[PDB]
From Swiss-Prot, chain A:
Included stretch of the parent chain: 390 to 437 of 1273
Superkingdom of this protein's organism: Viruses
Name of this chain's protein: Spike protein S1
Function: Attaches the virion to the cell membrane by interacting with host receptor, initiating the infection. The major receptor is host ACE2. When S2/S2' has been cleaved, binding to the receptor triggers direct fusion at the cell membrane. When S2/S2' has not been cleaved, binding to the receptor results in internalization of the virus by endocytosis using host TFRC and GRM2 and leading to fusion of the virion membrane with the host endosomal membrane. Alternatively, may use NRP1/NRP2 and integrin as entry receptors.
Substitution effect: D16N: In strain: Omicron/BA.2, Omicron/BA.2.12.1, Omicron/BA.2.75, Omicron/BA.4, Omicron/BA.5, Omicron/BQ.1.1, Omicron/XBB.1.5, Omicron/EG.5.1; complete loss of interaction with host integrins
Integrin-binding motif, as annotated region: 14-16
Length: 48, 49, 48
């Protein structure tokens, strides 16, 4: 498939908090550091 | 009528659950209510005839 | 948290808590800098 434009965001987080990177999730990270839109499209790649 | 969903209270569905399956529940509610209204309209049309 | 003396590490106390309302925000006033590591739950969402 072809995409109109591509945005890449990179950071480093805690192991337990990796589940907070998802639309509709709540917590410290999902609220005060990084919020994803509910109708989000795209991928998340997280590795130790 | 819950229409097979977990609850019949729409704002409860919003508040108590995250969007992923809350969307499914709301879609089920909307489909059920729309079907009921359609059935009522058709029955009214027959009576009008 | 304000007890005069704590038990020794080997003979550590055990306290049960039930049927109460807890306001953990006050726990942020213990020291100017102190460890608050939390496992399996975000500290900012302990009031919900």
């Amino acid at each position: 498939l072809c995409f109109t434009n591509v945005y890449a965001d990179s950071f480093v987080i805690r192991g337990d908090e990796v589940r907070q990177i998802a639309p509709g999730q709540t917590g410290n990270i999902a609220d005060y550091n990084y919020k994803l839109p509910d109708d989000f499209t795209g991928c998340v790649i997280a590795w130790n | 009528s819950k229409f097979g969903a977990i609850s019949s209270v729409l704002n409860d569905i919003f508040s108590r659950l995250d969007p992923p399956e809350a969307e499914v529940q709301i879609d089920r509610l909307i489909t059920g209510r729309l079907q009921s209204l359609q059935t009522y309209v058709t029955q009214q049309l027959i009576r009008a005839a | 948290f304000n007890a005069t003396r704590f038990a020794s590490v080997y003979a550590w106390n055990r306290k049960r808590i039930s049927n109460c309302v807890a306001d953990y925000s006050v726990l942020y006033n213990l020291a100017p800098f102190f460890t608050f590591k939390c496992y399996g739950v975000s500290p900012t969402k302990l009031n919900d």
